[PDB]
């Protein structure tokens, strides 16, 4: 039962790791979108906005 509870704990930890890496991938997509938008903004940042 000790082995069993340790294995259930590490399975919960693996699930939490999967959730964390999915959130990390979502944040990477968000940072890529923010980088391309700020690149467009730096390209368009001129007088009369164009």
């Amino acid at each position: 039962e000790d082995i069993d509870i340790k294995r259930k704990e590490i399975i919960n930890k693996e699930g939490e790791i999967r959730d964390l890496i999915s959130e990390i991938d979502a944040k990477a997509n968000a940072i890529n979108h923010e980088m391309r938008s700020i690149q467009r903004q730096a390209e368009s940042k001129t007088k009369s906005l164009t």
Binding site: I3, D4, R7, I11, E14, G15, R18
Partner: protein, 48 residues
């Protein structure tokens, strides 16, 4: 229809995630009982 297709794909990916969770659980239940107690070699020592 495009957003319907993408939410269907999201449901399919969720089903694949559940399948991978089931695979992890069965791999755990398989490797958990490898060298636990089946090392009874007294009979084969007597035999040898």
């Amino acid at each position: 229809s495009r957003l319907k297709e993408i939410d269907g794909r999201l449901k399919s990916t969720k089903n694949e995630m559940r399948k991978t969770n089931f695979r992890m659980t069965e791999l755990k239940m398989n490797v958990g009982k490898v060298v636990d107690t089946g090392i009874l070699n007294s009979k084969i020592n007597e035999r040898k």
